[PDB]
PDB file of C-alpha atoms in Angstrom:
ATOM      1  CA  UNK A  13       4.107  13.270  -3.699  1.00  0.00           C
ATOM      2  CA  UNK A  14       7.202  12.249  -5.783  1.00  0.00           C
ATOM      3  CA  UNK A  15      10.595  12.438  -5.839  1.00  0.00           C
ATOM      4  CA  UNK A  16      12.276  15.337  -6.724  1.00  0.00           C
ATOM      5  CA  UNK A  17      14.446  14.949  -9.902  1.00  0.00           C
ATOM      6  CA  UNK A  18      13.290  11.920 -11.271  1.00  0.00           C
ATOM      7  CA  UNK A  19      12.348  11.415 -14.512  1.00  0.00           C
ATOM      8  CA  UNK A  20      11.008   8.383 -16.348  1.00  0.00           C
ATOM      9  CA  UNK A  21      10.965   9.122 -20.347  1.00  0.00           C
ATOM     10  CA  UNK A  22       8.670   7.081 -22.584  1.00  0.00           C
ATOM     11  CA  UNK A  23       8.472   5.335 -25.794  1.00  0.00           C
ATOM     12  CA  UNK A  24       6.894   8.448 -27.051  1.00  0.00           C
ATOM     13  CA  UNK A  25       9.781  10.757 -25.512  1.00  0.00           C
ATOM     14  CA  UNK A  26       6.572  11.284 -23.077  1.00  0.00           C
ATOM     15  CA  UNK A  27       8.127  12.545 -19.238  1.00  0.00           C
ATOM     16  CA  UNK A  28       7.001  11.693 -16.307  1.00  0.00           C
ATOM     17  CA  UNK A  29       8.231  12.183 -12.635  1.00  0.00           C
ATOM     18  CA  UNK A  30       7.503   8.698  -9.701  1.00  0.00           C
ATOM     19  CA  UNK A  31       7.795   8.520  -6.177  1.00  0.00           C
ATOM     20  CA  UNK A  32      10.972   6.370  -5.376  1.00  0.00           C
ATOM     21  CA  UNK A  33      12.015   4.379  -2.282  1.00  0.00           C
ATOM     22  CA  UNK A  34      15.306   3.247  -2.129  1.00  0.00           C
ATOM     23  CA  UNK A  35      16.251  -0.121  -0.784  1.00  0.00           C
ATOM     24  CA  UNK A  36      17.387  -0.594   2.849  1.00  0.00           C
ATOM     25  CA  UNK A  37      19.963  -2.870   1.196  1.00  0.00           C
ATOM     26  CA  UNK A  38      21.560  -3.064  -1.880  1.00  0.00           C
ATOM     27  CA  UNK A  39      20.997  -5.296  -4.001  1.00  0.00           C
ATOM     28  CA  UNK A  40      17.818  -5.898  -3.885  1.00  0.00           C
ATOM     29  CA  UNK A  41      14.742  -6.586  -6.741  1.00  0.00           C
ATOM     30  CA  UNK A  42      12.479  -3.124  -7.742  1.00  0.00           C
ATOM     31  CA  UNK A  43       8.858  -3.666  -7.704  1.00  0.00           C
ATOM     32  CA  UNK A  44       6.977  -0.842 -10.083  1.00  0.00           C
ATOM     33  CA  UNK A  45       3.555   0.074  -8.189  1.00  0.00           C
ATOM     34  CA  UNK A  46       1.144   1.254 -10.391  1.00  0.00           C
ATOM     35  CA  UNK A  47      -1.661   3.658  -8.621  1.00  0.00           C
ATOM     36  CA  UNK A  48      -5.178   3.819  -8.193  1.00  0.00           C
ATOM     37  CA  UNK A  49      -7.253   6.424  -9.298  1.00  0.00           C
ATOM     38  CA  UNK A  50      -6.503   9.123  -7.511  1.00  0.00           C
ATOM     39  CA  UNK A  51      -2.801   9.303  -8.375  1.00  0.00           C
ATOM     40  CA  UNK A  52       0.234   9.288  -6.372  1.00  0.00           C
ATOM     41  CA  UNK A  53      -1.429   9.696  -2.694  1.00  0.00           C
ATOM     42  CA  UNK A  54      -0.883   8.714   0.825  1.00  0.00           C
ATOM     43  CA  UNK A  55      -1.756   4.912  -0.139  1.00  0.00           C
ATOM     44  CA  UNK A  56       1.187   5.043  -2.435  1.00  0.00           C
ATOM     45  CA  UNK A  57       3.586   6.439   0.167  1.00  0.00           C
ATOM     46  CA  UNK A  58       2.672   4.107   2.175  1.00  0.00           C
ATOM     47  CA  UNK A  59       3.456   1.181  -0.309  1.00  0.00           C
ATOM     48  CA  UNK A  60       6.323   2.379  -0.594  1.00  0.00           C
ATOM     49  CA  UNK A  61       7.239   2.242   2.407  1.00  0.00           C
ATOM     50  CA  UNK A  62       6.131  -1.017   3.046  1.00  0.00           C
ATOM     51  CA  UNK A  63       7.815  -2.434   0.552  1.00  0.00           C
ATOM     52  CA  UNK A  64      11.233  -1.628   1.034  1.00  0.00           C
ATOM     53  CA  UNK A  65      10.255  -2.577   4.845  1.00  0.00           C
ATOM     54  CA  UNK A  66       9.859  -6.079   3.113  1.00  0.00           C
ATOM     55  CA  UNK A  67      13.435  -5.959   1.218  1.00  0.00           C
ATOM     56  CA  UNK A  68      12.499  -4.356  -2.014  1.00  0.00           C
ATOM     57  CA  UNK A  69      13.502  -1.095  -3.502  1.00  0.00           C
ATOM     58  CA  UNK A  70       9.915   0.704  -4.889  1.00  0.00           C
ATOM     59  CA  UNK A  71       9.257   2.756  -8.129  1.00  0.00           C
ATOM     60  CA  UNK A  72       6.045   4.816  -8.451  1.00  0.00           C
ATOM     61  CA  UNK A  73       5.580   6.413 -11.266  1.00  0.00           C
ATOM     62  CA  UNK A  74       2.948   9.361 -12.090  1.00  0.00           C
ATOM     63  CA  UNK A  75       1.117   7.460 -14.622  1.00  0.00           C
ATOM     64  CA  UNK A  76      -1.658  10.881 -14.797  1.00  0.00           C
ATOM     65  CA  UNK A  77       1.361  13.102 -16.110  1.00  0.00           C
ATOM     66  CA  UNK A  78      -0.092  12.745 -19.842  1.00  0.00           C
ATOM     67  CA  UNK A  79      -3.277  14.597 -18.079  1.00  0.00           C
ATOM     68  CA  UNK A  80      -2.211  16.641 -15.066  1.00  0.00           C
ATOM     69  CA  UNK A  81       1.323  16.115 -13.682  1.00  0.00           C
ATOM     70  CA  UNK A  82       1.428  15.680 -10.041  1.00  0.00           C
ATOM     71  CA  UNK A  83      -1.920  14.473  -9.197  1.00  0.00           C
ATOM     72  CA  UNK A  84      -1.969  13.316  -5.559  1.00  0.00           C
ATOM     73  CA  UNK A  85      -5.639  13.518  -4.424  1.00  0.00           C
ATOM     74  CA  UNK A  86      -7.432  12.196  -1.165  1.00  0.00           C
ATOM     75  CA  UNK A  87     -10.395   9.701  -1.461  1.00  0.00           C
ATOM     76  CA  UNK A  88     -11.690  11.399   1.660  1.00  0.00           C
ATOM     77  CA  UNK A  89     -12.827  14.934  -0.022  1.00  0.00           C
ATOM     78  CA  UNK A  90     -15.474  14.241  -2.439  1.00  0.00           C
ATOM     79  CA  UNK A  91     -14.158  16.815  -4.675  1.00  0.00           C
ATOM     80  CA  UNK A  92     -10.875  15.255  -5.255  1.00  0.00           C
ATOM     81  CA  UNK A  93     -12.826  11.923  -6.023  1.00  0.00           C
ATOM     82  CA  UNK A  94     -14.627  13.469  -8.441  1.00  0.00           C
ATOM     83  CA  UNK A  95     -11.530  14.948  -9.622  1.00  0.00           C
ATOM     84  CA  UNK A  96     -10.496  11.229  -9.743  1.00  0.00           C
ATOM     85  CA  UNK A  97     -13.159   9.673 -11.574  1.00  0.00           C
ATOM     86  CA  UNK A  98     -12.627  12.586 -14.374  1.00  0.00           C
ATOM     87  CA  UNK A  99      -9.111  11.854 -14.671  1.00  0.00           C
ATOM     88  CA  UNK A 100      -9.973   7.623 -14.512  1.00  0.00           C
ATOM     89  CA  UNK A 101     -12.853   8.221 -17.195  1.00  0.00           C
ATOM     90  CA  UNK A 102     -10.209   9.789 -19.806  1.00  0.00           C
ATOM     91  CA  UNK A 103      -7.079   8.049 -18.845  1.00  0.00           C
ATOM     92  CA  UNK A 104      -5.373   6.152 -21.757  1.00  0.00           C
ATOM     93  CA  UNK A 105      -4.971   2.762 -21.285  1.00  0.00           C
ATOM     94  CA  UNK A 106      -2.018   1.891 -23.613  1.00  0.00           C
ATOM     95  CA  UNK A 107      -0.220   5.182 -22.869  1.00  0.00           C
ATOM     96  CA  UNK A 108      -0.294   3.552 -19.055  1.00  0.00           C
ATOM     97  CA  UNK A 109       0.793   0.207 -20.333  1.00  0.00           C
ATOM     98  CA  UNK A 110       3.747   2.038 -21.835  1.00  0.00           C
ATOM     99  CA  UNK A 111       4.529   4.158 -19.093  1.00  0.00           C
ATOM    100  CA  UNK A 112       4.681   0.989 -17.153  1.00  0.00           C
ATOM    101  CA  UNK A 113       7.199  -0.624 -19.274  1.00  0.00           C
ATOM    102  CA  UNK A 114       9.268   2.611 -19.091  1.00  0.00           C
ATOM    103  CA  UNK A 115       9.118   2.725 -15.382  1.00  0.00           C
ATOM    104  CA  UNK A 116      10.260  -1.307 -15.931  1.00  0.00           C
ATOM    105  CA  UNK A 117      13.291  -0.934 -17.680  1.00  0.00           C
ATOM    106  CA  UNK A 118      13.892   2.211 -15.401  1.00  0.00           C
ATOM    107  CA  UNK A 119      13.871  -0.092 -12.526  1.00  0.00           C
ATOM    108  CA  UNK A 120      15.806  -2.516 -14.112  1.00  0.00           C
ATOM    109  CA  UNK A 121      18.638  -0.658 -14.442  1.00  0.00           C
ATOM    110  CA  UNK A 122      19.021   1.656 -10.588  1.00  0.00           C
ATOM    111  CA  UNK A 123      22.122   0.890  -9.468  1.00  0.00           C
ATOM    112  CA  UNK A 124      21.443  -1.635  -6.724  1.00  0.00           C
ATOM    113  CA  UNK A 125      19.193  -3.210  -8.868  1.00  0.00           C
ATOM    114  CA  UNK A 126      19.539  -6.960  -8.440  1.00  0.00           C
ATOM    115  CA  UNK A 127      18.051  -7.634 -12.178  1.00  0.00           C
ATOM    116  CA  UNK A 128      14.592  -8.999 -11.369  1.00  0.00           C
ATOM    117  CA  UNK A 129      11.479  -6.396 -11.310  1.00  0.00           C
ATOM    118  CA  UNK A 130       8.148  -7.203  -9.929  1.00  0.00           C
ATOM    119  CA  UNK A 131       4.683  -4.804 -10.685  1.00  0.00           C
ATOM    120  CA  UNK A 132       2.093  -4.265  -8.308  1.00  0.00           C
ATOM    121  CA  UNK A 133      -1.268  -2.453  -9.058  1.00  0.00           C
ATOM    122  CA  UNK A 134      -4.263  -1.291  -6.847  1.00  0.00           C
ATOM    123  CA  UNK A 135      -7.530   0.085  -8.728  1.00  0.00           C
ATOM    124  CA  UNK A 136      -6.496   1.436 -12.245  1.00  0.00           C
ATOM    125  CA  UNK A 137      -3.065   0.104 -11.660  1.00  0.00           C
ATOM    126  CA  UNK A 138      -4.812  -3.798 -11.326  1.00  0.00           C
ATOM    127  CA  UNK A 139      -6.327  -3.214 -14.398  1.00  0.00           C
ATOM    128  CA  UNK A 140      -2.624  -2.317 -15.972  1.00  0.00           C
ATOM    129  CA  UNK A 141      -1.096  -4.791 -14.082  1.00  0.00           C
ATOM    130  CA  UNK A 142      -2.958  -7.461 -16.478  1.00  0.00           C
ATOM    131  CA  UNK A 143      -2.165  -5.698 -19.181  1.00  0.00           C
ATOM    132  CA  UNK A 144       1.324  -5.474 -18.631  1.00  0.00           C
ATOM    133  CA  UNK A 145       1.886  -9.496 -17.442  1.00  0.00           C
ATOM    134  CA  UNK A 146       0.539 -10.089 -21.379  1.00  0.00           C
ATOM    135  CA  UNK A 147       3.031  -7.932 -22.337  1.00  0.00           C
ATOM    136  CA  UNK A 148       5.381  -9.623 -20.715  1.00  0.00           C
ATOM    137  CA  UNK A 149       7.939  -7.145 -19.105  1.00  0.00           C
ATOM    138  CA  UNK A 150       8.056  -8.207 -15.975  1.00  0.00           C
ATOM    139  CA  UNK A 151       9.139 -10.726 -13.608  1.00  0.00           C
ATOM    140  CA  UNK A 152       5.866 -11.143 -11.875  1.00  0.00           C
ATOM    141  CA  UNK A 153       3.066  -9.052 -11.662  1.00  0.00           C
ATOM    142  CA  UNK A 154       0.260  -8.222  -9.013  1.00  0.00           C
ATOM    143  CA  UNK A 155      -3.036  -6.778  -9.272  1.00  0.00           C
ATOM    144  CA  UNK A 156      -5.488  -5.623  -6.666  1.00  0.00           C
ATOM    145  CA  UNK A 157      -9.351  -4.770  -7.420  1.00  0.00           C
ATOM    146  CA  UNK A 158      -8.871  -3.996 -11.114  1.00  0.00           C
ATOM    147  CA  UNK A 159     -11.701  -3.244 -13.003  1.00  0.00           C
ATOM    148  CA  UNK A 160     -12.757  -4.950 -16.424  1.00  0.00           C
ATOM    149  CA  UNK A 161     -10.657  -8.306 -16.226  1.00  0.00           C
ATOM    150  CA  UNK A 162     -13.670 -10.091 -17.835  1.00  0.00           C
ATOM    151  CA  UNK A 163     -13.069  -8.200 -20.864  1.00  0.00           C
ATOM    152  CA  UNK A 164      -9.302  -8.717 -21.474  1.00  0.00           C
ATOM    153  CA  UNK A 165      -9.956 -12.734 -21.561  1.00  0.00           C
ATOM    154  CA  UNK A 166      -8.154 -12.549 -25.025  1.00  0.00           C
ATOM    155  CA  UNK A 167      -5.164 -12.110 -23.147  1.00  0.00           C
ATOM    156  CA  UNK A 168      -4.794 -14.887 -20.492  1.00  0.00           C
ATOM    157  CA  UNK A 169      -3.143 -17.035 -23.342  1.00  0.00           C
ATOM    158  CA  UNK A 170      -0.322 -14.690 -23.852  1.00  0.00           C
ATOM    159  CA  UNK A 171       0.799 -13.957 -20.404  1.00  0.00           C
ATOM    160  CA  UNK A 172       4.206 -16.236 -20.034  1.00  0.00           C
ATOM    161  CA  UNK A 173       5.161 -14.785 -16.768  1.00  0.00           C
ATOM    162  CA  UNK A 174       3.524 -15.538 -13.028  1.00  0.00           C
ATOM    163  CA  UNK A 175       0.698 -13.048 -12.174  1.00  0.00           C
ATOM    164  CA  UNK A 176      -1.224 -13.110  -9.271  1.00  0.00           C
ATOM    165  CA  UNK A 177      -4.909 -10.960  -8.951  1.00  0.00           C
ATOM    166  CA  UNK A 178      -7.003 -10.242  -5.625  1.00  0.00           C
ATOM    167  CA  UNK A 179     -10.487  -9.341  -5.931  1.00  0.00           C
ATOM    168  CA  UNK A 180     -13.362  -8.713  -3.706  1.00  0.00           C
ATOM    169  CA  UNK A 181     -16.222 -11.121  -3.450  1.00  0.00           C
ATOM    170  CA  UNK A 182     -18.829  -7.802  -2.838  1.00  0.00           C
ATOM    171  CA  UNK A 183     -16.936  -5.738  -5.633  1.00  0.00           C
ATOM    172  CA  UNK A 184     -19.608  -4.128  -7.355  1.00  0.00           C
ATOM    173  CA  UNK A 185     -17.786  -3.949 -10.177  1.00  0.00           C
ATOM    174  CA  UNK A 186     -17.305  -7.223 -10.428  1.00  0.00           C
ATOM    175  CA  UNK A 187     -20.301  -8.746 -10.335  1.00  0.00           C
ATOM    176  CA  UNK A 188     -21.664 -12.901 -10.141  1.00  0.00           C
ATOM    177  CA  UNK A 189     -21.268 -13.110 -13.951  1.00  0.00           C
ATOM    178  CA  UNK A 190     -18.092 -11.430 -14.463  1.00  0.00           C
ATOM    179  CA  UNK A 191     -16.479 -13.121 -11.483  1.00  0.00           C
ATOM    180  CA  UNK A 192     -17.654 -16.076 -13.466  1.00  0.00           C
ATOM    181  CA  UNK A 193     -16.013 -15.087 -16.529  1.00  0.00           C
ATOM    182  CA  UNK A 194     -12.563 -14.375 -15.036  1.00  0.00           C
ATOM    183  CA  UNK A 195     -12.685 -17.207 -12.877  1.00  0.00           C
ATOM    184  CA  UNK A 196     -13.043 -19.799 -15.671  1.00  0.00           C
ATOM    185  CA  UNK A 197     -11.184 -17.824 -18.319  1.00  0.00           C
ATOM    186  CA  UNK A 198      -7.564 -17.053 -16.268  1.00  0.00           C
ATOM    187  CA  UNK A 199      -8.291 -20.667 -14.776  1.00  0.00           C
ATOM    188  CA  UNK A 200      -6.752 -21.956 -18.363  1.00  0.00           C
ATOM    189  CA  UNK A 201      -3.496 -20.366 -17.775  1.00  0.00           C
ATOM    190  CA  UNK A 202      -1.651 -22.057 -14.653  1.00  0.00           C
ATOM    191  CA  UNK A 203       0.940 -18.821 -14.500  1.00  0.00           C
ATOM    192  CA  UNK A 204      -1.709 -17.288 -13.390  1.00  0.00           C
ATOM    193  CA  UNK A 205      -3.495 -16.801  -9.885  1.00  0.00           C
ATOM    194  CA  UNK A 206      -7.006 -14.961  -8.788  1.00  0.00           C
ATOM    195  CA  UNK A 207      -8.316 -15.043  -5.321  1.00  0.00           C
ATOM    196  CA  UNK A 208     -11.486 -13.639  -4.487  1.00  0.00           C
ATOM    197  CA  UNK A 209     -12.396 -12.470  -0.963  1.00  0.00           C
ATOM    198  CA  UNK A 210     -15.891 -13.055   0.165  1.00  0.00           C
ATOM    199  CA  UNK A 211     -17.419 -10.564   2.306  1.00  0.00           C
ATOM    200  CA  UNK A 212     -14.605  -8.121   0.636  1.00  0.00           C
ATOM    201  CA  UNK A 213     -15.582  -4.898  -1.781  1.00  0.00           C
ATOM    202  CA  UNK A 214     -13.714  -2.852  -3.674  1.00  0.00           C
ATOM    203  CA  UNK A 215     -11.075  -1.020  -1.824  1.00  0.00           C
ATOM    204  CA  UNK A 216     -10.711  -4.038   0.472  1.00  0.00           C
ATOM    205  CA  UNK A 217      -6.776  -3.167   1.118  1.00  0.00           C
ATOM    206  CA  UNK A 218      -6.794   0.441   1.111  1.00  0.00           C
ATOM    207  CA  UNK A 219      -5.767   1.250   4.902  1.00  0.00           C
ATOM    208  CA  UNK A 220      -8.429   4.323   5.443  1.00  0.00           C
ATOM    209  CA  UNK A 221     -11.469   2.668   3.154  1.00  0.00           C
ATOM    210  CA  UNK A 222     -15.055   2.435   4.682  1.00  0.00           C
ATOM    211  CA  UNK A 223     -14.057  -1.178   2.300  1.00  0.00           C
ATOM    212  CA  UNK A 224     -11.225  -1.819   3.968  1.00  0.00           C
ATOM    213  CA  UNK A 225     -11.445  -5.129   5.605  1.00  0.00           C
ATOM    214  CA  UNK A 226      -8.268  -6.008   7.969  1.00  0.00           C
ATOM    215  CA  UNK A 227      -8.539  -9.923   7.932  1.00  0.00           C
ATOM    216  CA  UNK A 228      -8.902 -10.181   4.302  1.00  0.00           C
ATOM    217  CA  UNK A 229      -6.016  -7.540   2.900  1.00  0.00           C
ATOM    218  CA  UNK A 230      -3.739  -9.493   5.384  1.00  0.00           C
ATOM    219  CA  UNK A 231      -4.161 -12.451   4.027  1.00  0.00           C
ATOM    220  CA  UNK A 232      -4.086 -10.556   0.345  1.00  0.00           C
ATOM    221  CA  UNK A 233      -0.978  -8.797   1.814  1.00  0.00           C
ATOM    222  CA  UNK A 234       0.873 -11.957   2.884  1.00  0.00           C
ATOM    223  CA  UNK A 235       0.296 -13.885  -0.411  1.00  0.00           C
ATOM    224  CA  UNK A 236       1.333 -10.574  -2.016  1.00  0.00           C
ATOM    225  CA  UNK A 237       4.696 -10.923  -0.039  1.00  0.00           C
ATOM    226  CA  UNK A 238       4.982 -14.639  -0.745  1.00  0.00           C
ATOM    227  CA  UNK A 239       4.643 -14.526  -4.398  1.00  0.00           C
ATOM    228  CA  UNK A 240       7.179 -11.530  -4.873  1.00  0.00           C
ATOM    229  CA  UNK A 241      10.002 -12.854  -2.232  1.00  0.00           C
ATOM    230  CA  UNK A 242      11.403 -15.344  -5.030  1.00  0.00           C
ATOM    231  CA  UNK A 243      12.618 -12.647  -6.914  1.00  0.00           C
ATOM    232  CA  UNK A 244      14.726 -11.696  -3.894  1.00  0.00           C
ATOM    233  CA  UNK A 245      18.173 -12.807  -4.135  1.00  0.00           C
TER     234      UNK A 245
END
């Protein structure tokens, strides 16, 4: 689902439309979410939602538009994850990192914006959320579950702006060696944060998952919260 009428252009004159959720009052800081795999779903309405419950305004932007415009699919039918996983496989990486910093400076500027922008990212969007904290566009940055962290280790030096990462201690994509690897490597960078939940998988925060695990995205949840509220005014 997204909002009717908006439109995000990119550095590349690339369109693209985002699910938007409007502060309860203005101002108040915009956090960008960036999705997970399956596009601009149920989990992101409910983000959304959540968010501006918590005194932000929310920005989700339909980061599959360079592939399929509109993609909203539901991890419960296996034919939309597979639908998923072909769109995840061929998704551009720095396109995404661009459309990010679009959907930034987007944010920045709403009206009741009160000029500080936060990103959070589940799944794919973890993965960009890195990406983008090296980047530097943002005020802080948040990523849940993203995928290939040990192979962006390059980049822990140039991030100059807080960014905090939750992972699952029974991710399979994150396995002992890897967790070892990001562990050590983001350790060198005290703007940064990674906490790992044991017992946790993958989807550990995704209200719906067989991974969900209620204890453990609460506790991701409230540092979440805790870690964005000083950009509140």
């Amino acid at each position: 689902m997204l909002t009717e009428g908006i439109s995000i252009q990119s550095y590349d004159g690339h369109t693209f439309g985002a699910l938007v959720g409007s502060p309860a009052k203005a101002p108040a800081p915009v956090i960008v979410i960036a999705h997970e795999i399956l596009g601009v779903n149920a989990f992101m309405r409910e983000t959304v939602s959540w968010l501006v419950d918590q005194g932000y305004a929310a920005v989700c932007p339909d980061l599959y538009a360079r592939q399929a415009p509109g993609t909203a699919l539901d991890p419960q039918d296996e034919a939309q994850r597979e639908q998923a996983y072909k769109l995840w496989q061929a998704f551009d990486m720095e396109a995404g990192v661009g459309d990010l910093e679009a959907a930034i400076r987007y944010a920045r500027h709403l009206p009741y914006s009160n000029g500080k922008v936060g990103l959070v990212g589940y799944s794919l969007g973890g993965a960009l959320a890195f990406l983008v904290a090296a980047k530097g566009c943002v005020d802080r940055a948040v990523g849940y579950c993203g995928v290939g962290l040990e192979k962006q280790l390059d980049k822990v030096p140039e991030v100059k702006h807080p960014a905090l990462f939750h992972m699952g201690g029974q991710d399979h994509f994150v396995p002992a060696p890897s967790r070892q690897l990001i562990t050590e490597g983001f350790g060198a960078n005290p703007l940064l944060q990674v906490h790992w939940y044991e017992g946790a998988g993958h989807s550990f925060a995704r209200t719906g998952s067989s991974d969900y695990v209620a204890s453990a995205a609460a506790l991701a949840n409230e540092r979440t919260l805790d870690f964005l509220a000083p950009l509140q005014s």
